[PDB]
């Protein structure tokens, strides 16, 4: 009767049982459909593909991400991914196991209730609870206060908490994530000369981003050095074999996160919005929030992101106020660790919302029993 | 030998000549600056925009409100707004026109000093003076007794007065007029599905709340009947051509005004602070104020706020005391009408702050004369 969890992030679904230190299914969340009609008989030729199969045979299948910016867009593709996760990777029937879910803040109540309704009416789950993808990272870190900054492939939000009491009026959210960064990277590569417009090429650009992309303290100094010398030009090979070279783009990409004016957005960066959020709270808790701020989720594994954020927040805040960043190496799976811990806890059991409650009260119950 | 008035609101600004009974030039107090560097050459492009021009063309310009909660924070933008409203909308030279200013009750003395110094130096006017929006809103109706509750765009307050003598130990101020309201409306719209984070979207939300949202009487009963019956869902069109439906947000926004807990504060609603201010006053003026309590300000234009306000104040107040709340039309311009009446009064002329006083005792003279 052990519980499980499945963080269905916009980048990849992390699904795994509870009471474990690491997940099992780390599989990408993409649905691929064959571009052509297909004529082979008896050798695959399926009408759809999901998971690592798409990433493998991506040169033909047109790809689609079902969820974007954390809101779902294709419920059919979403339930197909859920079926593939539950019946192929985990190899378990959810009828005899609960299912903990995850969602970003300030999301459509319609989306949340539709997720709950489909999970209850399609899989016959006994219970189904949701939560934020930040309190779980906090639990995984093992603290009870501080501010948490998640930068998932779909969204980028920051939330403060003090002794377990959240502050909704201080929560901040932005639609900047790895997809806009990959688009800007493709644009600047076309500027260089290399063209990338398809979906498989988008995945290749995302792999390049995950492989070689950093940040620096003095963006102008780095630009000057890259324009003067060539010590930053790094090489990368492709499946075709024709190697390519990339220059200042590797660090010019995250400047979008640090300067959304590059892509066109008018909102401020992560440092400014974090400072604003902290300022929205009370000073007696700001003093501690400045001392322990944690990073989580993808898009923050870049090397040197800690130093840039530290310098920015220190220049924006008084000097006498000490500041310390928390960016461990186990961040890509921090939300899953938090979900597993919460599912393994004892009291949380009483909070599980079962089937009869939904059947008698409808989906609207999820907006009360949960956050 | 005529006069001039210019009420500088946190959200809007209304200026013109005295004597008249209505304002001449009212427009939003904002500044729009182009964010997308690089334009098509030959056609020419301006550096910054102000007034209705920004609101007319804003998809490319980022907007900035130089005033926040009644306090000034962008003196350059304030000077630009003053120049625009003194040279374009009116086309009058202020060197031969004594002007009049407004200011919330409690504000930085340094802010007032900088305002008067700017108005004296950068314009070379004959004289000037400041006042409180409460006194002018009261002069508008003409009554001299009672309490007045003002609520602009970023600042609100309540002030009593009896036979011309004001009680400074009872004035109350809060920062819940329309800005946190617009923010909470954006939040609830995001909760519903529609996203509004930019400045043009902020103006769109301002317009939709000005046109649709309204306060209720029984918050719980209204929420219940709205969740059960879909008779309150109202549609609104956007500049592009889309249509968006809104339900209980129309109640939740004024409810947030009444219960700042939804915004993250611990202060009490307007009714509680009004009753507290009236309590600190003596008993006779308490009685005389319960009867004549006026509400003004743009935020005050919510349909159904007077009835709910009087209901709450009666429920929390003792009986045998008739509470006749008043809220006449065109109240958002009551400050302008009061300022015009004051400038027209002959006696008030002697209270003008001339240029010699400023040149002699500096700008701090504003306090002594106030």
């Amino acid at each position: 009767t052990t519980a499980l969890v499945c963080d269905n992030g916009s980048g990849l679904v992390k699904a795994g049982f509870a009471g474990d230190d690491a997940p099992r299914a780390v599989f990408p969340s993409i649905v691929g459909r064959p571009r052509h009609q297909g004529v082979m008989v008896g050798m695959g030729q399926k009408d759809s593909y999901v998971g690592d199969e798409a990433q493998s045979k991506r040169g033909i299948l047109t790809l689609k991400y079902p969820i974007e910016h954390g809101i779902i867009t294709n419920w059919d593709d979403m339930e197909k991914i859920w079926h593939h996760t539950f019946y192929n990777e985990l190899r378990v029937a959810p009828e005899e196991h609960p299912t903990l879910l995850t969602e970003a803040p300030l999301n459509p109540k319609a989306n949340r209730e539709k997720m709950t309704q489909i999970m209850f009416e399609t899989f016959n789950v006994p219970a189904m609870y949701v939560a934020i993808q930040a309190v779980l990272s906090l639990y995984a870190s093992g603290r009870t206060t501080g501010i948490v900054l998640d930068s998932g492939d779909g969204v980028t939000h920051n939330v403060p908490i003090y002794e377990g009491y959240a502050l909704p009026h201080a929560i901040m959210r932005l639609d900047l994530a790895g997809r806009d960064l990959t688009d800007y990277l493709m644009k600047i590569l076309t500027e260089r000369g290399y063209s990338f417009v398809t979906t498989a090429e988008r995945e290749i650009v995302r792999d390049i981003k995950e492989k070689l992309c950093y940040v620096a303290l003095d963006f102008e100094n780095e630009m000057a050095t890259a324009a003067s010398s060539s010590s930053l030009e790094k090489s990368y090979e492709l499946p075709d074999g024709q190697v390519i070279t990339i220059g200042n783009e590797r660090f010019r990409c995250p400047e979008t996160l640090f300067q959304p004016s590059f892509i066109g957005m008018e909102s401020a960066g992560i440092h400014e919005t974090t400072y604003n959020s902290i300022m929205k709270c009370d000073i007696d808790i700001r003093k501690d929030l400045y001392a322990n701020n944690v990073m989580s989720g993808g898009t923050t594994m870049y090397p040197g992101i800690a130093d840039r954020m530290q310098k920015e927040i220190t220049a924006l805040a008084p000097s006498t106020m000490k500041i310390k960043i928390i960016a461990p190496p186990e961040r890509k799976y921090s939300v899953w660790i938090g979900g597993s811990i919460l599912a393994s806890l004892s009291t949380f059991q009483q909070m599980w919302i079962t089937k009869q409650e939904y059947d008698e009260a409808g989906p609207s119950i999820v907006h009360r029993k949960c956050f | 030998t005529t006069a001039l008035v210019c009420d500088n609101g946190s959200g809007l600004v209304k200026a013109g000549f005295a004597g008249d009974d209505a304002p001449r030039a009212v427009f939003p107090s904002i500044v729009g600056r182009p964010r997308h560097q690089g334009v098509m050459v030959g056609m020419g492009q301006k550096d910054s925009y102000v007034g209705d021009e920004a609101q007319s063309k804003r998809g490319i310009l980022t907007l900035k409100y130089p005033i926040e909660h009644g306090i000034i924070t962008n003196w350059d933008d304030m000077e630009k707004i003053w120049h625009h409203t003194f040279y374009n909308e009116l086309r009058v030279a202020p060197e031969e026109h004594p002007t009049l200013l407004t200011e919330a009750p409690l504000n930085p003395k340094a802010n007032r000093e900088k305002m008067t110094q700017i108005m004296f130096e950068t314009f070379n006017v004959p004289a000037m003076y400041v006042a409180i929006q409460a006194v002018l809103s009261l002069y508008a109706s003409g009554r001299t007794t009672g309490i007045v509750l003002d609520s602009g765009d970023g600042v609100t307050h309540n002030v009593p007065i009896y036979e011309g003598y004001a009680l400074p130990h009872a004035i109350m101020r809060l920062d819940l007029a329309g800005r946190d309201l617009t923010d909470y409306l954006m939040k609830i719209l995001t909760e519903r599905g529609y996203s509004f984070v930019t400045t043009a979207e902020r103006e769109i939300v301002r317009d939709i709340k000005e046109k649709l949202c309204y306060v209720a009487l029984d918050f719980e009963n209204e929420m219940a009947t709205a969740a059960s019956s879909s008779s309150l869902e109202k549609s609104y069109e956007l500049p592009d051509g889309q249509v968006i439906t809104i339900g209980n947000e129309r109640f939740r926004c004024p409810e947030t005004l009444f219960q700042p807990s939804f915004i993250g504060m611990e202060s009490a609603g307007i009714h509680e602070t009004t009753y507290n201010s009236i309590m600190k006053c003596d008993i006779d003026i308490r009685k005389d104020l319960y009867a004549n309590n006026v509400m003004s300000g743009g935020t005050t234009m919510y349909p159904g706020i007077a009835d709910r306000m009087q209901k709450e104040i009666t429920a929390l107040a003792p009986s045998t005391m008739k509470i006749k709340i008043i809220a006449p039309p065109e109240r958002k311009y009551s400050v302008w009408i009061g300022g015009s009446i004051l400038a027209s009064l002959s006696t008030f002329q002697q209270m003008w702050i001339t240029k010699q006083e400023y040149d002699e005792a500096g700008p701090s003279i504003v306090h002594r004369k106030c």
């Binding site: 300022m279 000073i283 | 926040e68 909660h69 306090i71 924070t73 930085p108 920062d175």
Partner: peptide, 7 residues
Amino acid sequence: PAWLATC
């Protein structure tokens, strides 16, 4: 925010 300290 524009009170040189709190808010």
